[PDB]
Amino acid sequence: MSQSNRELVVDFLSYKLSQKGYSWPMAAVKQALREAGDEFELRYRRAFSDLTSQLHITPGTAYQSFEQVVNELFRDGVNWGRIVAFFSFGGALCVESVDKEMQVLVSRIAAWMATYLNDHLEPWIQENGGWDTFVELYGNNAA
Amino acid sequence: MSQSNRELVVDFLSYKLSQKGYSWPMAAVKQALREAGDEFELRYRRAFSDLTSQLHITPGTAYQSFEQVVNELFRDGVNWGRIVAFFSFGGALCVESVDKEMQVLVSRIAAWMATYLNDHLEPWIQENGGWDTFVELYGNNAA
């Protein structure tokens, strides 16, 4: 419970943050869950479209919001099938969430740079031949 | 300027978001800048410690903050060496920024799950043999 489930989730969230190339018995238990993780996500290629847009992970949402949802999963009752789901869903949320929060951060910071150029540096950049000049110098290497 | 620098940054920010394995003439110009990007970051292994802690990318900072810094780079005046820097620095900021903003999001969401277990599911999970039971069933595959 304390540091057995905590350790489970961490593993599953990692493996799932792997699979779709991004950053990041017992050990037996972990693998066994991975497989059922894939076996379920495979069977349901509904692009998990449900949340691939809905919650998307509100920038600093509330656990009560999360809990409020999952409850629906488990409404009827509880079984293992319904549990891997919880897991599979958890990752799918962690994947979007990040992938969708990373692309924006990058954007934000991308703007910041492009701007700083067109505003301060294009003047000077232009007065000196331009990017053709750069490449004339810094091209091929330093040597 | 408009869609020439914009296109430059995007490329450099991408290549730099590559290098350190994460998500994501002219074409000549892009490569030439990449190299000088590496050649500079190589020469200065100061872990770019300067910002690997300072600005770290405040959760929703202000461009005026950014601009306020870079200005210091360019204070004395302007040259190409000082420009790749601006670029190199830009990426280094984009790398931390994300890498540091991703690890947290993951955390936040990791907690949420581990909790939901110890709170709602450990009761039921325990009453049924436990994770040893899971693996008894969902182990090896479905077949």
Swiss-Prot record, chains A, B:
A motif (BH3) lies at residues 29-43. Potent inhibitor of cell death. Inhibits activation of caspases. Appears to regulate cell death by blocking the voltage-dependent anion channel (VDAC) by binding to it and preventing the release of the caspase activator, CYC1, from the mitochondrial membrane. Also acts as a regulator of G2 checkpoint and progression to cytokinesis during mitosis. Pfam families: Bcl-2 (PF00452), BH4 (PF02180). GO terms for biological process: apoptotic mitochondrial changes; apoptotic process in bone marrow cell; cellular response to alkaloid; cellular response to amino acid stimulus; cellular response to gamma radiation; defense response to virus; dendritic cell apoptotic process; dendritic cell proliferation. Bcl-X(S) is expressed at high levels in cells that undergo a high rate of turnover, such as developing lymphocytes. In contrast, Bcl-X(L) is found in tissues containing long-lived postmitotic cells, such as adult brain. Keywords: Apoptosis, Cytoplasm, Cytoplasmic vesicle, Cytoskeleton, Endocytosis, Membrane, Mitochondrion, Mitochondrion inner membrane, Mitochondrion outer membrane, Nucleus, Phosphoprotein, Synapse, Transmembrane, Transmembrane helix, Ubl conjugation. It comes from Homo sapiens (Human). A motif (BH4) lies at residues 4-24. The gene is BCL2L1. Disulfide bonds: none annotated. A motif (BH2) lies at residues 123-138. Belongs to the Bcl-2 family. Proteolytically cleaved by caspases during apoptosis. The cleaved protein, lacking the BH4 motif, has pro-apoptotic activity. This phosphorylation is partial in normal mitotic cells, but complete in G2-arrested cells upon DNA-damage, thus promoting subsequent apoptosis probably by triggering caspases-mediated proteolysis. Phosphorylated by PLK3, leading to regulate the G2 checkpoint and progression to cytokinesis during mitosis. Changing residue 91 to E: No heterodimerization with BAX. Changing residue 81 to A: No heterodimerization with BAX. SMART domains: BCL (SM00337), BH4 (SM00265). GO terms for molecular function: BH3 domain binding; channel activity; identical protein binding; protein kinase binding. A motif (BH1) lies at residues 72-91. The keyword Transmembrane applies. Homodimer. Interacts with BCL2L11. Interacts with BAD. Interacts with PGAM5. Interacts with HEBP2. Interacts with p53/TP53 and BBC3; interaction with BBC3 disrupts the interaction with p53/TP53. Interacts with ATP5F1A and ATP5F1B; the interactions mediate the association of isoform Bcl-X(L) with the mitochondrial membrane ATP synthase F(1)F(0) ATP synthase. Interacts with VDAC1. Interacts with BCL2L11 (via BH3). Interacts with RNF183. Interacts with GIMAP3/IAN4 and GIMAP5/IAN5. Changing residue 99 to A: No effect on caspase-1 cleavage. This is Bcl-2-like protein 1.
